[PDB]
Amino acid sequence: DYCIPNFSQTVNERTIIDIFTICRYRSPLVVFCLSHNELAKKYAQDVSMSSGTHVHIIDGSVEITVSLYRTFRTIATQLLGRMQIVVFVTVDKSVVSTQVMKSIAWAFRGSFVELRNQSVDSSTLVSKLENLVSFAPLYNVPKCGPDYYGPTVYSELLSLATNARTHWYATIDYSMFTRSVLTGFVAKYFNEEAVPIDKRIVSIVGYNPPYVWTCLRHGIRPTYIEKSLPNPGGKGPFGLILPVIHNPQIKLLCLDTFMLSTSMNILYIGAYPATHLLSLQLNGWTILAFDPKITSDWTDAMAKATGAKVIGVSKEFDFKSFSVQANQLNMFQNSKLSVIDDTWVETDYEKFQSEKQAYFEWLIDRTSIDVRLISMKWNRSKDTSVSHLLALLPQPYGASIREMRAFFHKKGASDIKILAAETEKYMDDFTAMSVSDQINTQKFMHCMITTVGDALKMDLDGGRAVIASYSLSNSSNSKERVLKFLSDANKAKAMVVFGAPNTHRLAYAKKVGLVLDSAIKMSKDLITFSNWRDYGYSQSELYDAGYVEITIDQMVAYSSDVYNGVGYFANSTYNDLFSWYIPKWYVHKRMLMQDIRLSPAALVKCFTTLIRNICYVPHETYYRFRGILVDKYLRSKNVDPSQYSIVGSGSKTFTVLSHFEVPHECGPLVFEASTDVNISGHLLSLAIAAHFVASPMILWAEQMKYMAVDRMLPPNLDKSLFFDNKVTPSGALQRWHSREEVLLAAEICESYAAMMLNNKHSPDIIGTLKSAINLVFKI
Amino acid sequence: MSNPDYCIPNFSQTVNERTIIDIFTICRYRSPLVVFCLSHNELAKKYAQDVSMSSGTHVHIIDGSVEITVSLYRTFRTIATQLLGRMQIVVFVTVDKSVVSTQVMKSIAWAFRGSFVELRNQSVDSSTLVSKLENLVSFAPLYNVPKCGPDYYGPTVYSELLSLATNARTHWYATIDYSMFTRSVLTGFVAKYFNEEAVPIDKRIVSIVGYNPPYVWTCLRHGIRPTYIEKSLPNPGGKGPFGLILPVIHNPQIKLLCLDTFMLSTSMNILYIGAYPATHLLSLQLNGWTILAFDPKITSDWTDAMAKATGAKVIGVSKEFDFKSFSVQANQLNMFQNSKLSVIDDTWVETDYEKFQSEKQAYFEWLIDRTSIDVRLISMKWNRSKDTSVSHLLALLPQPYGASIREMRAFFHKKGASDIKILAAETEKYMDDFTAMSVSDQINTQKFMHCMITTVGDALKMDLDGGRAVIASYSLSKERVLKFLSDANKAKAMVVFGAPNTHRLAYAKKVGLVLDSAIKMSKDLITFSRWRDYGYSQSELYDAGYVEITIDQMVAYSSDVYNGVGYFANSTYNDLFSWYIPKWYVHKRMLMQDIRLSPAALVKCFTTLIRNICYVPHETYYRFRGILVDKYLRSKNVDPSQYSIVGSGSKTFTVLSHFEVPHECGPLVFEASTDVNISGHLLSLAIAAHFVASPMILWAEQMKYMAVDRMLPPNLDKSLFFDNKVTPSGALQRWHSREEVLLAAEICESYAAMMLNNKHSPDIIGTLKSAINLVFKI
Structure with missing residues (x-):
């Protein structure tokens, strides 16, 4: 057609496919905190010069709120650009806290690295900085989360042995x-x-x-x-006796997270070192832990990382004392209790298990303690009767180990005979199964x-x-x-x-x-x-x-x-x-x-900017189009053109010359003489984004209804979380838009989507969002 | 690890023929850059923040906190990777002209396909400076200053993009x-x-x-x-010796530019009568021309201004031309003896118009047959109501940028007809034909003027x-x-x-x-x-x-x-x-x-785009290169024990014992205990040559020259070499050996097949490979 802007030749169904494809890349950001500005400038220069990464440094030469606003208003437009973005933060934790900077990073779908406590020659700091240059445009810190345990191994991207390739x-x-x-x-x-x-x-x-x-x-x-x-198919009242058949510590985590779900109080027998527990948050748990290798340091380290109350005992557990006052069990009087027994011995193991078995058959029947679940390793070469046995299971990540797990429970079988030959044949079959089928037997423990x-x-x-x-x-x-x-x-x-x-x-x-x-x-x-x-x-x-x-x-x-x-x-x-x-x-x-965590900031401009770039839409021209769409709508509602003057700017869609009204099911829209109308631009943008990814539109609309007037900031929130919106002298979140400005935007939304996507938008998507907005603003 | 669909990097799922189409489409956007020079740094930071925050434009400021050469290197190595990102880029330059000159900064800008704006030394409140700065925000991601050129005269009118009257659209x-x-x-x-x-x-x-x-x-x-x-x-189909008497049938300055650019082609020397104002001529470079200008409206300032702007030697005379004095020693035509000369006559009259034209035309018939001056061509307006015979006239032509005028143009020449009568009813029928035609065909009358x-x-x-x-x-x-x-x-x-x-x-x-x-x-x-x-x-x-x-x-x-x-x-x-x-x-x-002769604006932008799409880490890319050389050496039956693959940015591999690879430009010779770092830019230029014209041959000739350090040429601003290593001696440091270049040419086909998921062009690679082998012919 030989005109710009151009949607007619640039946007077709193949363009839409490509927008979908680009959406797989919509999380390009890394936020990297450190205390050394010359180090940040060096790696900023190195990564941008070598890979084209867009780099920002929030260094404190500008007030923190204005720096965040400038930096992340810019970034919000670029998230569909398929180029990495790195924000280095070198102001002190006193200027912007870890939790705030992490909140902002994750609101923008980014990786977060907090290293501001590190000295300039910290080997960990230099290593993580060098990883920016090596991996760009990728990075080996996950987005929106500290940890990752899937099959992607970034080190494999560097090894010739592994063909510089990894799983994805x-x-x-x-x-x-x-x-x-x-x-x-x-x-x-x-x-x-x-x-x-x-x-x-x-x-x-x-x-x-x-x-x-x-x-x-x-x-x-x-x-x-x-x-x-x-029914699992096995023996006992619940069929869990022999049912029909990448964290490095996952074998311990599989059992322990299950066992930790059964009681807030845990007897942990053979606990040292229990390193895998350090990653869990266990506030409200009490762990009584028996191991001779236990020390005072291990006790304090365990409670500090998990938040649980840890009683660490540097002894063997006393399996021969059949008293509730023995083994310190006193603390669990009139409480629930579960028991994780990890103990074993290499010699006379069969005898050791027999004595433990007798003990647990006693312990599960205490009346002064409500004992929920007991787990014990099982490897028996002889036939043996058991009481209160609820389950006898293989270990889901046990691989080819010959060990089973027995679980005691008040509602178990009252008595059952475990034949050693049947268990051995069961372990024959289990150890012969693929690793997956082995793992999927964790469903037997989760039955409980x-x-x-x-x-x-x-x-x-x-x-x-x-x-x-x-x-x-x-x-x-x-x-x-x-x-x-x-x-x-x-x-x-x-x-x-x-x-x-x-x-x-x-x-x-x-x-x-x-x-x-x-x-x-x-x-x-x-x-x-x-x-x-x-x-x-x-x-x-x-x-x-x-x-x-x-x-x-x-x-x-x-x-x-x-x-x-x-x-x-x-x-x-x-x-x-x-x-x-x-x-x-x-x-x-x-x-x-x-605040930023609850905002649509990371969706409200990146699709619009992508389309303006493709379709040759200048910044001001975009606002003229919005005025033109409002002009056409007001005419379609038979508003006399002498009542309004289209301006089509970013701050003035039109000015009202004389009072007029537009009928609307959410109360007539009312425009008063000598007023400026600025319709809600973000509604139009979110309706486009809602074509491709999940939409924050309804939550945004409820906040927009609330924001017809200034609203005081919540007292207990860091005010830096509000950097992306204007705040008044009085310290309130400043009003955004009238209901007229929102609903007018809702009214032209369909024409806007038809414009931006060359009439290849979805009328149904727009319609369901318009209905919800109308119910939000129901009168 | 067998299915590449669930592995990164990934070319198998990400690069198909539709991916290739999209790369072609993105090449239409490969000129995102604006270079804006101004002397006010806070002003630059304001508009940097405004354009960046509103449109996502990537912004740099070269402010002299860093030495100019390192600043250019950091800024433009970065930009080079981003040219296919489809986002506007703006470099503000606020150092003085003595840190980086206008001509140097313009060279760098245009080497990167950018617009160039020089407004340093303007005051912080200059309305022009503010207007152009505001235009960055209004138009982003577009800009209304052309790329690689000061001026533009096509159908695109950027102000129409901001007009509700024009539907906020313009031609493209x-x-x-x-x-x-x-x-x-x-x-x-x-x-x-x-x-x-x-x-x-x-x-x-x-x-x-x-x-x-x-x-x-x-x-x-x-x-x-x-x-x-x-x-x-x-055949022109008209009267006269050459047929040029009546042949058969968005510059605002274009009406006057048309004749004057042609007339300036005929002679380095021009007598211009009725010259004022001659504004359209200020846009030309006229050094080596001489213009004797006769007009009463001429002043001293006007002459000084015309000589300043065109470089011509300009002698302006505030009199009316003496058309009655038939002497070469009259109208200062003294200066033109033993010289070639043409005459542009723009003098008209409302009263006694034909009488004035016969006065001049009888002067031009005398002038055109001279012998102490070589008179080449004389132009004058023609509008006769009755019949006139005329001497020494080659062409009577209509004005091509004459919309509907009655007047025509006559050109005198030695080889024009000796005598010919011009009848008024013929020319009147002729101009009625001219007025009748469309303006498109009207302007094409230029062809009869260009025959000369x-x-x-x-x-x-x-x-x-x-x-x-x-x-x-x-x-x-x-x-x-x-x-x-x-x-x-x-x-x-x-x-x-x-x-x-x-x-x-x-x-x-x-x-x-x-x-x-x-x-x-x-x-x-x-x-x-067709x-x-x-x-x-x-x-x-x-x-x-x-x-x-x-x-x-x-x-x-x-x-x-x-x-x-x-x-x-x-x-x-x-x-x-x-x-x-x-x-x-x-x-x-x-x-x-230097940057003007470099591939810098194409050697990185396609590679970066592909690495983003295909999940290729920076260091992984160099490992892939090492693997490609491993696969090549084995296909030449080089025993693997003779080398050790490294695959980093600076070492492709290490030679363990002496070996040689047969090559029509070789053999390629590898000495024990040496490191080999192939030319990476050959590989990426070969990809870029799939989609746009290629600097690969010029680059290869420069690469052949750079096997050793080479002293910089003394007549060139050293800042034009910012993108390459320069020794403390002041020499361009060597780049690669012939082995490292030819090895890269040898693996080039496998590199293109890898980067483009076997959807590359073997014939493009082959013609580049053959040309490189000819550059390095032994």
Whole structure:
């Protein structure tokens, strides 16, 4: 057509595919804190000159709030540029705290490195700096999380031996990150609501093994809810006696996180060193730990890292004293207790186990202590009767070890004979299985923290925390039934976190040709994932049921100061097809004040900037287009053109010359003479972003409703978290927009999307967002 | 680890034919840079923050906190990797002109395909300075100053982008505008060549092979004179000896530029009567011309100003011309004895108009037959209501940029008709025809004016002695062209050659970018939409003694004499063409690689884009290079125990014992206990040559020169060498051995296959490889 701006020739369905593809790269940021400005300048220069990385240094020559505003307003526009961004922070922790800088980093989907306590020649500091240059545009610190345990090994990218290649499972890794963030969000909910620690229990709807680890990394305990529990096939009252069949410390973590979910109080026999426990948060736990190798230092180090109360005893455990007053067990009078016995001996092992067995058969029946679970290593060459045996299981990461695990329980079999030949044949079979099938037997231990019941009918009193997705959204539950349950959950002030495929995003991705019918099919909202049937849900359906979408980014930034999960490296198209939702009562209670963790900053400009770059849209021209879209809408509503003057700038869409009104189902929009109207630009931008990734739009709209007037900043928040919004002399968050300015934006949203994407937008996506906005502003 | 789909780096899932299409598309955006010089650093920081925060533009400030050479090195090594990022980049320069001069900074800017703004020494409140600064924010990611050129005159009007009246849109004709930019650059290159060769001003004449109207303007903008060469002349169909009496049928200055640029082609000496104001002439370079200007409106300031701006020697006389005094010692025509002279007459009259014209025309009939002055051509306005006979007149022509005027133009000449009567009813019927036509066909009347500076003949037969300058493409049989080019290089002539690049075009067709409906090709014979021509390759031209140079390089090399137009968008169509200059000039003047002659604006940006897409870490990239050399040495049956692969940025491998690799430019010889670091820039230039014209041949010749340290040329600002290592002696440090270069050429095909997931072009690599082997011929 030979004109600019040009959407007609630059945006087609293949451009849209490429935008989807670019969305896998939307987390380019590293935030790197250190105390040595000349060191920062050197590695800034080295990485930008060698790899093109965009580098910023917040060094304190500008006031911290203005530096953050300038730096991250710029970065917000560049997140779809497919170039790494590194912000070095060299001001002292007194100028901007670790927790604040971490919150900002994760709100922008970045990696976070805090090394400001290091001296200039720290070998760790120099190493992490040199890693910037070596790996750019990648970096080996995860985004939005301290740790990572998937198959990607960055050192393998440097080795000729390994062909300078490594593993990359974006979808699987982002799904683990998501489980982690959802757990971290519940932990942040518990902490904000001041829930007592023994009540920090979350119900996982549908069995989902990684949550045991993520929960215990956050100091909460999981329980699984299953409709029907299959019988494992083995012996005993629950069929767990011989049922039918990359953390380096995962063998210890598998058992210990499970065992830690059964009781706030633990007898740990053979505990030294228990290094894997140092990564967990165990505030509210008490650990009585027996080992001769234990020292006073190991005790204090263990309580300092985990927050648990640790009683460290430098003795062998006394298996011959059948007293509740022996082995210091006194502390657990009138309490719950579980017992992790890790002990073993290389000689007379069969005898040692017999005496332990007799002891545990006694211990599980105490009346002054409510003993929940006891685990013991089992390796027996003879036939042996056992009482109170609930389970006899293989070790899921035991590999080819010949050892089983026995679990004692009040509700076990009263008596059973364990034939050594059957166990030996069982271990023959188990050790002969692939590593995966071995690992997937952890489902046998998790049976013991699974409840049977219909999640739709569960008791939601007392602020109960629940995490639910497929087991609620699958075809077997009607949408009508799920939405009533959710509406009732929000009514009860429960915390059911709900996730589901987003109907209109998925239909869009198929429409432009990204997703093939071979991979995923849908009929209306009924979805068939290839390699099960699911119901998609939309934002307006859920808002009517009292639920507000929140992004994974927002959840982890919100949870940043309690978060202890994993991060991620790549974004994933498949995960982006899903949306997550939290109850409106919690949003109104705690999220109407938009600090950076709760803001759409990392989505509100990067798609617009990408499209302006592609389509040759100058900065001012963009605002002229917005004026022109408002002009066309006002004419379509038969407003006399003499009543308004289109300006089309960034601060003035139009000026009102004489009073007029536009009819609208959320109360007539009213424009008074001699006023300037500045419609809400961020609504238009979020409606574009909502075509490609999960959207913070509904949460943003609720904050926009709240922000018709100045609002005092919350007292207990660091005010630097509000850097991205204007604050008044009086110290209040300054008003944003009138309801007229928001709803007018909602009214032209469809025309704006048609403009920006060359009429290849999704009318259905815009429509569901418009409905939700209209309900937000309902009169 | 078997499925590469779940491994990084990853080329198998990330690079398909559609990825290749998108790289072609991104090349249209490969000129993001603005260089803005101003003397006020807080002002620069304000607009840096504003453009960065609002549009994401990447901003640098060179403020003199760091030494200028290191600052240029840090800023432009960074920028070089980012040129395909599709985000605007702005370098603010606030040091003084004595730290980095205007001409140097302009050279660097244009080498990186940037716009250049010089506004240092303007006051902090200058309205022009503020306006241009505000334009950065308003227009980002676009900018309204052209790239690689001060001026622009095409359909794009940036102010229309801010107008609700104009729907906030404007015209965008990338190919047409980039073709005009290219004509302008080629002219500028020839003007730079004349200056470096110290050609006498009056010999600064270029032959344009094939009629090409815009070159008259571009040549006069650069103080050089055009002549066209055509195989055949269609008969003008008019009266007079040559048929030029009545032939058959966005510069605001264009009406006056049209005649005056032509007239300035005929003679280094001009008598201009009725000259005031002559504003349009201030845009020309006229050094070596002489202008005797007669007008009562002329003052002392006007003469001083015209000489300042054009460089011409200007003698302005505040009288009316004495048209009645038929003496060469009258109107100061004294100064023109034994000289060539043309006359431009703009004097009109409202009363006694025909009477005034017969007064002049009887003076020009006397002047045109002189003998102590060589009078070449005289132009005057023609508007006669009754019949006049006239002597010594070659052409009576209409004004091509005459919209609907009644007046015409008459040109006197020695070889014009001796006597001819001009009847009023003929010319009245003629002008009614002229007024009737569209303006598009009206302006094309230029062809009759341009006949007077056209010679007929076979361009391949032309006399090439004397360093003769020629611009030649389409109007220039493949074997015959290459022989003539070969002979032109042997003769040390300056024939500048351009042609479609066979293998780039074939690649663009094969991945699906350009359709068989727009451009067809059979081997190297191309059918455009209809006309046909041959594609040429870089090895074919090197064999004929010619070296590819890019348009970017030509304009940066010529920056200190350039006075042409810039551009805004790059163009896929134009990028299908390559331009070439004779090897003798390359060896004489281009073997020392300052930034203007460097591949810096293409050697990194494609590699970086691919590494971002394909998840290739910086150090992993050098490991891949080591692996590629490992695979190559084994396929040559070199025993692995003779070398040890390192694969870092500075050591590809270590030689354990002496070995040799057979090579047509070799053997390649490797001595025990030495480190080998192959040329990385050869590999990345080979990728870049898939998509745009290539500096690879010029680079290779410079690389051959750089096997040892080389002292910098003394007449050049040393800051132009910022991008390469310079010794404390003041020498350009050596780069690579011939082994390290040729090893890279040897693995180049496997490198392209790796980076592009086997969707590269073996023929592009092959023609580059063959040309490099010829550069390094033993």
